[PDB]
Every structure is written in structure tokens, then in C-alpha cells.
Amino acid sequence: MFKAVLFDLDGVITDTAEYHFRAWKALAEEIGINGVDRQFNEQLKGVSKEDSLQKILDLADKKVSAEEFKELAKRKNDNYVKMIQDVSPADVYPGILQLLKDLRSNKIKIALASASKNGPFLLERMNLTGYFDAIADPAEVAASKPAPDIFIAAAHAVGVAPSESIGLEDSQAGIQAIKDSGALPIGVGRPEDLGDDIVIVPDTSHYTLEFLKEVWLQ
Ligand SMILES: [Mg+2]
């Protein structure tokens, strides 16, 4: 049987994308730029702050100094930290709390493998910290997803090899990272998005201990 489950945070445990979106929209509004909506935000998800801010400035063809660029980036981050003060156990995705309980009661290790710089904070606000054996620190990993580094770090931090683990992700880059780590991916979302070569479930309510066991046995 697998010995650990390695979780991403956004799109598996909870929705942090909402709060990044709100932070960018608030920034864009503060400086009088229109067009930062949920569709435009698809060009901001999972890219650097620099890239994101470039794209936003381009909406109005706005030029900035290096000093102004740095201030705007800081402002977005401050906005984000303010907006996540709201997070509560009400923000946990369906099935996830029961899955953590079941994993823990079956002595399976639980690790977070997220690029979030606020992962410990978020897990504390959602009252999930107690279930986590480790949180991989993205500050201490050399390469982001789709590189396998953060999944290797998460597995190692609970004393297992990635080949002893299942990874749960909703993103192409995350699924690729799990595959290249040696862990078994189980995706959540659409095969159209994540590929035909992995087990995919339509939403997190399908992530049950019994399902993960059956997938492992294949
Ligand atoms: Mg994710």
C-alpha cells in the first residue's frame, strides 16, 4: 500500500486562485486600469509576479520605473495577505477533511507540496495543521512545477520515497511534477485538461481512502 499522500493546496484542498485574482483586480483598480476580469486572469494564473504585472500594465499601455514596478508588486502581495485573512474551515474543498482523517487514522503520511508562500498559515486558518506530517517549504526547493523537486521534498520530509506515495493535483504542471517524482498521480478535473494516461476524478468528493487504495492496487 502507498505510505504517503502529497497534496497541492490550490485546486485540491482549497481555492487560493480567487484571492490572487482579487489582489490583482484591486491593484489594477487602485491605479485606474480596466479589464482585469476572471477571463483575463487566466493569463495571470501560475506565472511570475513580473509577467502578471507586465500584462496588466499593457492593458492601458502604462510605463513604470523599476522603483514603481517593485512598489506595485509589493502592493499586490500586501493585498493578497489581507484578502486571505478571511480563510476559514468553510473554505476546505468537499471530501478533503474526511480524507485527511481517514489517512491519519490508517497511519498514512500527509504532506503539502505547494508553491504557496502562505501554506502553513492557510492550513492553520482551515484547522487542518494537525493532520499534516510535513509542509514542503517552496523557499528551499530549486525548481517549481513541472519540475518534481517540491514533491520529492514533501515525500522526503515525511520519511518516504516518492515511489511510495500518491500525489493529488488539478494542474498539468503539477501532474507532470508528480509523474517525474516517481509518485502516482491522481488528478481532479477534466481528462481534456490533464491527460488520458492517469486516473482523474471530476471533483474532490471522489478522493476517498477507498478510491485511492483501488487506484494503487492497479
Ligand atoms: Mg493545484
UniProtKB/Swiss-Prot annotation:
Which cofactors are reported in the record for this sequence? Answer: Mg(2+)
Q: Name one GO cellular component term.
A: cytoplasm
PTM section of the record: Autophosphorylated.
Effect of substituting residue 46 to A: 1'000'000-fold decrease in catalytic efficiency
Q: How does activity depend on pH?
A: Optimum pH is around 7. Relatively stable in solution within the pH range of 5-9.5.
Q: How is the cofactor bound?
A: Binds 1 magnesium ion per subunit.
Marked site, Important for catalytic activity and assists the phosphoryl transfer reaction to Asp8 by balancing charge and orienting the reacting groups, at 114, 145
Give the E.C. number(s): 5.4.2.6
Q: Known activity regulation?
A: Activated by phosphorylation. Competitively inhibited by alpha-D-galactose-1-phosphate.
Is Disulfide bond among the key words of this record? no
Query: Reported effect of changing residue 20 to N?
Result: 300-fold reduction in the conversion of beta-G1P to G6P in the presence of beta-G1,6bisP
Cite the binding residues for Mg(2+).
8, 10, 170
Q: What upregulates it?
A: By maltose, trehalose and sucrose and repressed by glucose and lactose.
What the entry lists under CDD domains is as follows: HAD_BPGM (cd02598)
NCBIfam families noted in UniProt: bPGM, HAD-SF-IA-v3, PGMB-YQAB-SF
Q: What else is known?
A: The catalysis proceeds via a phosphoenzyme formed by reaction of an active-site nucleophile with the cofactor glucose 1,6-diphosphate (G1,6-diP). The phosphorylated mutase binds either G1P or G6P and transfers the phosphoryl group to the C(6)OH or C(1)OH, respectively.
Q: What does this protein do?
A: Catalyzes the interconversion of D-glucose 1-phosphate (G1P) and D-glucose 6-phosphate (G6P), forming beta-D-glucose 1,6-(bis)phosphate (beta-G16P) as an intermediate. The beta-phosphoglucomutase (Beta-PGM) acts on the beta-C(1) anomer of G1P. Glucose or lactose are used in preference to maltose, which is only utilized after glucose or lactose has been exhausted. It plays a key role in the regulation of the flow of carbohydrate intermediates in glycolysis and the formation of the sugar nucleotide UDP-glucose.
State the similarity comment.
Answer: Belongs to the HAD-like hydrolase superfamily. CbbY/CbbZ/Gph/YieH family.
Quaternary assembly: Monomer.
Name by which UniProt lists this protein: Beta-phosphoglucomutase
Instruction: Provide the species name.
Output: Lactococcus lactis subsp. lactis (strain IL1403) (Streptococcus lactis)
- Give the organism's phylogenetic lineage: Bacteria, Bacillati, Bacillota, Bacilli, Lactobacillales
Provide the gene name from the record: pgmB
